[PDB]
């Protein structure tokens, strides 16, 4: 039963869950990869990795992906969670230099991953492995777009490091802008493309219905994470959360803030339903009787289908994953799965 404050009856009724058939293999393969790359201690992998549901989250999202593509995505996704944990620990322990050096290595590795496959920092080596595999599916133009997007993401994490060290809580609009980067909206949007086997031309992926449907799917993901992760984040002195920007800067109570975040999330869903009709119409228009048109139509339809799947995968992930079960931790400020 989903806690009442978090429950979204529209998701439960109108966004039925899907699961990619490769999921059982995926779960074990990513577990093995976390182990082999030493991204988590073996005992924490054993006790917590499956319960974190990171592979489940991606297998409920990129339906239709080739198994090899889904594997690279899931390994990268598990890496991303461990990176969020590393960032958090560097902030909590005041390791500004370790963070600055990591920030610089990730920018460099992102451009030349094969050069970093055996880097001394296992977090950099794990990143490089997943990124080198992601760069082997589509043309270099897609790789460069992924890289452009993730450089921006790394810098947004750097801004978060400074806000948290300086005790600054961003304002609402400042936060909303920053959250499109820290949630990595455009990375997940880029990854729709190797999942359906096609780098989309700019004229297609920048069509306003495709752009808007893509944006709303990610706003939902980010803001619903804010709603569900708020208790862990308060306990951990995290300042980045739409709710916190509202408590801090609009004098809402915790209760009023949870309500406003929920209202924003609900409205995302019904705005998505409207634009989804336009995006699927566009998918239809592309099928103009030509071979290329059929290819583009098929890829856009699959991508818009997965933009829809992200809602249900994210919703259930937050209720299933150990990552947010702060009530179960002996020390609420120190999740058990993090390297402290």
Ligand X SMILES: CC[N+](CC)(CC)Cc1ccccc1
Q: Would you list which residues are annotated within the binding site for Mg(2+)?
A: 84, 88, 225, 229, 233
Which residue, among 31, 32, 38, 52, has the nearest Cα to 337 in the 3D structure? 52
Q: How far is the CB of 307 from ligand X (least distance, A)?
A: 14
Q: How far is the CB of 127 from Mg ion (least distance, A)?
A: 16
Q: How far is the CB of 241 from Mg ion (least distance, A)?
A: 6
Q: Pattern 161-200, binding to ligand X, x per CB under 6 A? A: ----------------------xx----------------
From candidates 222, 242, 279, 302, binder to ligand X by CB under 6 A:
222
Q: How far is the CB of 175 from Mg ion (least distance, A)?
A: 12
Residue 16, classed as helix, strand or coil, is coil
Q: Under a CB-based contact definition with an 8 Å cutoff, are residues 299 and 193 in contact?
A: yes
How does DSSP assign 241-289, residue by residue? Answer: SHHHHHHHHH---HHHHHHHHHHHHHHHHHHHHHHHHHHHHHHHHH-SS
Rounded to whole angstroms, the Cα distance separating 117 from 131 reads: 10
Q: Pattern 211-250, binding to Mg ion, x per CB under 5 A? A: --------------x---x---------------------
Residue with structure tokens 């947004």?
Answer: 156
State the chain's maximal CA–CA distance in angstroms. 61
72 is in the binding site of which of ligand X, Mg ion, none (Cβ under 5 to 8 A by kind)? none
User: Which of positions 83-122 make contact with ligand X (CB under 6 A)?
Assistant: 84
Residues in contact with ligand X, counted by CB under 6 A, come to a total of: 9
How does DSSP assign 162-174, residue by residue? Answer: HHHHHTPPPPHHH
Q: How far is the CB of 80 from ligand X (least distance, A)?
A: 4
Please report the sign of the dihedral spanned by the C-alpha atoms of residue 253, residue 259, residue 261, residue 263: negative
From candidates 225, 245, 306, 309, binder to ligand X by CB under 6 A:
225
Q: How far is the CB of 122 from ligand X (least distance, A)?
A: 18
Q: Choose between 29 and 321: whose C-beta lies nearer to Mg ion.
A: 321
Q: Which residues are annotated as a binding site?
A: 84, 88, 225, 229, 233
What does the chain come to in residues? 340
Q: Choose between 45 and 227: whose C-beta lies nearer to Mg ion.
A: 227
Joined together, the tokens standing for residue 83 give 């990176």
Note every long-range contact of 168-172, with CB atoms under 8 Å and residues 24 or more positions apart, other chains counting: 168/239, 169/239, 169/244, 169/245, 169/248, 169/249, 170/239, 170/240, 170/245, 171/245, 171/249, 172/242, 172/245, 172/246, 172/249, 172/250
Residue nearest to ligand X (CB): 77
Q: Under a CB-based contact definition with an 8 Å cutoff, are residues 61 and 313 in contact?
A: yes
User: Which of positions 57-86 make contact with ligand X (CB under 6 A)?
Assistant: 77, 80-81, 84
Q: How far is the CB of 291 from ligand X (least distance, A)?
A: 34
Q: Choose between 84 and 271: whose C-beta lies nearer to ligand X.
A: 84
* 271 part of the interface to ligand X, by CB under 6 A: no
Q: Which residues contact 142 (CB under 8 A, 6 or more apart)?
A: 190, 193, 194, 199
User: Which of positions 27-86 make contact with Mg ion (CB under 5 A)?
Assistant: 84
222 is in the binding site of which of Mg ion, ligand X, none (Cβ under 5 to 8 A by kind)? ligand X
Instruction: Kindly list the residues in this chain that would bind ligand X in the complex (CB under 6 A).
Output: 77, 80-81, 84, 183-184, 221-222, 225
């Amino acid at each position: 039963a989903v806690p009442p404050s978090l429950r979204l009856p529209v998701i439960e009724a109108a966004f039925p869950r899907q699961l990619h058939p490769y999921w059982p293999k995926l779960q074990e393969t990513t577990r093995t990869w976390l182990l082999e790359k030493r991204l988590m201690p073996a005992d924490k992998v054993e006790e917590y990795a499956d319960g974190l549901c990171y592979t489940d989250l991606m297998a409920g999202y990129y339906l239709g992906a080739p198994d090899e593509v889904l594997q690279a995505i899931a390994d990268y996704s598990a890496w991303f969670f461990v990176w969020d944990d590393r960032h958090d620990r560097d902030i909590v322990h005041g390791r500004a230099g370790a963070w600055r050096r990591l920030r610089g290595l990730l920018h460099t590795a992102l451009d030349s991953p094969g050069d970093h496959l055996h880097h001394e920092d296992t977090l950099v080596a794990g990143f490089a492995d997943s990124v080198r595999r992601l760069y082997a599916f589509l043309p270099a133009t897609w790789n460069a777009r992924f890289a452009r997007h993730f450089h921006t993401v790394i810098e947004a994490y750097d801004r978060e490091f400074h806000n948290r060290t300086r005790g600054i809580v961003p304002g609402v609009e400042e936060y909303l802008e920053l959250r499109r980067l820290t949630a990595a909206h455009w990375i997940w949007t880029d990854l729709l493309e190797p999942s359906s086997g096609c780098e989309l031309p700019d004229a297609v992926r920048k069509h306003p219905a495709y752009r808007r449907a893509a944006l709303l799917s990610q706003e939902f993901a980010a803001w619903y994470n804010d709603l569900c992760s708020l208790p862990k984040e308060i306990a951990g002195d995290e300042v980045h959360n739409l709710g916190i920007s509202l408590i801090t800067h609009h004098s809402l109570t915790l209760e009023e803030a949870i309500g406003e975040v929920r209202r924003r999330v609900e409205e995302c869903i019904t705005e998505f339903l409207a634009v989804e009709r336009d995006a699927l119409r566009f998918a239809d228009e592309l099928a103009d009787g030509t071979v290329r048109g059929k290819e583009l139509s098929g890829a856009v339809r699959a991508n818009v289908g997965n933009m829809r799947n992200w809602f249900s995968s994210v919703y259930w992930f937050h209720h299933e994953s150990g990552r947010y079960m702060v009530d179960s931790w002996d020390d609420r400020s120190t999740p058990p799965y993090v390297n402290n």
